[PDB]
Design a protein around this nucleic acid. Structure first.
Ligand SMILES: O=C(N[C@H](CO)[C@H](O)c1ccc([N+](=O)[O-])cc1)C(Cl)Cl
Lengths: 110, 150, 117, 142, 56, 27
RNA sequence: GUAACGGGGCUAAACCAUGCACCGAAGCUGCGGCAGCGACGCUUAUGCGUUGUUGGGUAGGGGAGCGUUCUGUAAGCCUGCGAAGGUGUGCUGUGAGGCAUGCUGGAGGUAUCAGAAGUGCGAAUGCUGACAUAAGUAACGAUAAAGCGGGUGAAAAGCCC
RNA sequence: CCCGGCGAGGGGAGUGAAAAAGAACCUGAAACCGUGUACGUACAAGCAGUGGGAGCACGCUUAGGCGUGUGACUGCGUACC
């Protein structure tokens, strides 16, 4: 009984969210949250909401029992890049990409 | 192309490819290296090669039994339906009609029938005589076509 | 009468990237790199049809030599022996016989020894 | 049809003793090289190791002809500054006689991963004996 | 002070092979309040080693 | 309400003046 | 850095003279296959069919072809039972190609023979747009300088007292 | 109706032929970025291919040492314009 939750257009690069996503891949959901709670990363706050959202999706709609769930899939994809300009010396201009991510977390009792 | 005559670049020193014109045909917008003009596509045909050609096709029509000769071919009132009845009776459907004079009733009745065309002997052409399954000529139509090609 | 390229050009590229499957890095991804890779694959392929026929014979000869010397004669004398005995069995077959029927091979050594003396 | 091929998970590789006393250096190293490769097995196969294991005792008593015992020089570099070290045959026998037999065959074995694999089966001793008595090697006059 | 060739995606991966985070895996429980907490730190309720320090 | 941004990423900055400028050679 | 036998090595595995033996190429033979020319008391528009010989190619010349778009046949066939496009798979031509149907897609599709070309892209420091790399690397823009308590507050170094 | 800062963004229900047609909306290619399995890889040196050519894994080879993948060892081998 796979159940999904997602944060689309999270403002962090996929690279940075992935470090944290990796810590909880395959883990019991109760054990995963504690790991997230004491990981000192902005990205730990973003995905944790998603995991908790996913847990609540499992109780309310069908699944339930917090005991049975594991983080069976988690993957963090690239969102669109916002385009901006940074002035450099001698009138030269640089692009900056303010990169985003799609964070997906999947939970299941089996 | 609408636009300006200024070189974009300083010729040298900038790292870009050298440019002369934002209307160059390599550039987005304002291309078209060898642009088209209105032109006349019409071709010459020798008088004799035209007549010779009409004769060859007409002679084939005879050989393939697609040419139909009749004493008269006309219609009473200008009603396409009336013509339609006649054509079924003659076992014709996809057909060119060539008549002795530009008969008007016949001309009017045929306009809405796509598979039927009417023509006076004077106004014949090579492709119409081919483009229909059967071709009908009046006796008078023959005599006029004959004189014309001779 | 404007003619657009979209459909045909993709088909031509897809043929090449398909010939480049299994190749490393850009050679299986990037047409410009793949196209050079696939041709050179072809150049070597042509070549090694000719090379293949050199390599296998060297193998057969090397194996007959081993088995000939096992029955107490060198390759060079053994083949000469068979030729003067008018035996024509080629080295693909002899190298096969050298492996799977050592007793038949010994019998071909005597046949070639008799003629050679 | 298609040709036979040795399978490394089937091939047999046997055990031999060889006395290197009085034997000419490289005129023995040749026959070791040959046999370590399995060139003598009719089921020889260039990419597979069909060779045999070879003990060599009395490496300290292998001979060389002419003036080579004193004049023959072995060079190697240390990847440094001066690097070039140098030592005569007589000095090699003295220091470590096993090296002379080992250097000899190695330069006659194919160079490459298999090449390096064949060499592993050469077990040269300096003395007149070995610890491989359980391997039941049978004597070889080579 | 610049690449002569574009480095590969595999090499990129290798370079990142030490970027991985470490989980603490050593949270402890106050014997009075029952909360998990980092070792040698107070709890969210302001407990430490069974005794009520602070008050919040 | 997330309308595309102004961005203001028009890039006519190219190309600024470009001296060596520079080593002296070689006479 | 041995370093002027390619090297391991050779008193001979060196040179000289004689003699046999084998390895060796895309050389020649064999079997299978395609293609161009030439001669046939031939067939005899010619196709055939045996024989003969030729098929390394830059600039260039000569000869054959494939595909893309458009007009005709063209009020001509296919199509909601699923068109193009996309993406999978199968077979076949000497090649451009070609044919076949797994799933998407959700309306257009087009034999044959004709005709006309904005007709085929990897390079032009070609153009426009996306997206990589270096890289999670440099930097966060006066060396005037901050520390604590409250408060608000989802959350406070920066906000208010 | 839920998670959720009376947020964003998601998950349900419902509309709708179809929502993997949902306003960042016909189709929806690739460079590029991911997750999932198959095999390979830490004594082994170079236009990354090709000729050999062991395993191991699939589709049973659907009884036939047959197809796909992967491919250790090994012979040849300095991109294109
Ligand atoms: O640009 C110069 N040097 C070029 C480098 O491209 C060249 O190597 C050079 C060097 C020395 C020299 N000289 O000594 O007269 C002249 C040219 C100037 Cl110094 Cl001439």
């Amino acid at each position: 009984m796979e159940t999904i939750a997602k944060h689309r257009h999270a403002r962090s690069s996929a690279q940075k969210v992935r470090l944290v996503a990796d810590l909880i891949r395959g883990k019991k959901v109760s054990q995963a949250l504690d790991i997230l709670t004491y990981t000192n990363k902005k990205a730990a706050v973003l995905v944790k909401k998603v995991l908790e959202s996913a847990i609540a999706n499992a109780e309310h709609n069908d699944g339930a029992d917090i005991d049975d769930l594991k983080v069976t899939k988690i993957f963090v994809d690239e969102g669109p890049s916002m385009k901006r300009i940074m002035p450099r010396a001698k009138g030269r201009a640089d692009r900056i990409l303010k990169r985003t991510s799609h964070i997906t977390v999947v939970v299941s009792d089996r | 192309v609408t636009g300006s005559g200024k070189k974009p670049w300083r010729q040298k020193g900038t790292g870009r490819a050298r440019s002369g014109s934002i209307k160059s045909p390599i550039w987005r917008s304002g291309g078209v290296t060898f642009a088209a003009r209105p032109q006349d596509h019409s071709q010459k045909v020798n008088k004799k090669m035209y007549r010779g050609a009409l004769k060859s096709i007409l002679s084939e029509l005879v050989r393939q039994d697609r040419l139909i000769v009749v004493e008269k071919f006309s219609v009473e009132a200008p009603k396409t339906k009336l013509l339609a009845q006649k054509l079924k009776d003659m076992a014709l459907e996809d057909v060119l009609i060539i008549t002795g004079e530009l008969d008007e009733n016949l001309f009017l009745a045929a306009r809405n029938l796509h598979k039927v065309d009417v023509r006076d002997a004077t106004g014949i052409d090579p492709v119409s005589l081919i483009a229909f399954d059967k071709v009908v000529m009046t006796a008078d139509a023959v005599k006029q076509v004959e004189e014309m090609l001779a | 009468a404007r003619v657009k390229r979209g459909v045909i050009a993709r088909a031509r590229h897809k043929k090449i990237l398909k010939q480049a499957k299994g190749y490393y890095g850009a050679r299986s991804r990037v047409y410009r790199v793949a196209f050079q890779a696939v041709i050179k694959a072809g150049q070597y392929a042509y070549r090694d049809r000719r090379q293949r026929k050199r390599q296998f014979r060297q193998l057969w000869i090397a194996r007959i030599n081993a088995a000939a010397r096992q029955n107490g004669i060198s390759y060079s004398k053994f083949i000469n022996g068979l030729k003067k005995a008018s035996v024509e069995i080629d080295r693909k077959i002899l190298a096969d016989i050298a492996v799977f029927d050592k007793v038949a091979f010994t019998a071909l050594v005597e046949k070639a020894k008799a003629a050679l003396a | 049809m298609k040709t036979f091929t040795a399978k490394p998970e089937t091939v047999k590789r046997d055990w031999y003793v060889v006395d290197a006393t009085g034997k000419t250096l490289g005129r023995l190293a040749t026959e070791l090289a040959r046999r370590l490769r399995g060139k003598h097995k009719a089921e020889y196969t260039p990419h597979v190791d069909t060779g045999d294991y070879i003990i060599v005792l009395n490496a300290d008593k292998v001979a060389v002809t002419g003036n080579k015992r004193t004049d023959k020089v072995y060079y190697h570099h240390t990847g440094h500054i001066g690097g070039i070290k140098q030592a005569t045959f007589e000095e090699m026998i003295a220091r470590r006689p096993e090296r002379v037999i080992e250097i000899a065959v190695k330069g006659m074995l194919p160079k490459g991963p298999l090449g390096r694999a064949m060499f592993r089966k050469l077990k040269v001793y300096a003395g007149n004996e070995h610890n491989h008595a359980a391997q039941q090697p049978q004597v070889l006059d080579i | 002070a610049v690449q002569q060739n574009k480095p590969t995606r595999s090499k990129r991966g290798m370079r990142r092979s030490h970027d991985a985070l470490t989980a603490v895996t050593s949270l402890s429980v106050d014997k009075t309040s029952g909360e998990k907490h980092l070792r040698h730190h107070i709890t969210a309720d302001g407990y430490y080693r069974g005794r009520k320090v602070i008050a919040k | 309400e997330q309308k595309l941004i102004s961005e203001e990423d028009l890039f006519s900055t190219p190309v600024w003046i470009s001296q060596a400028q520079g080593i002296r050679a070689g006479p």
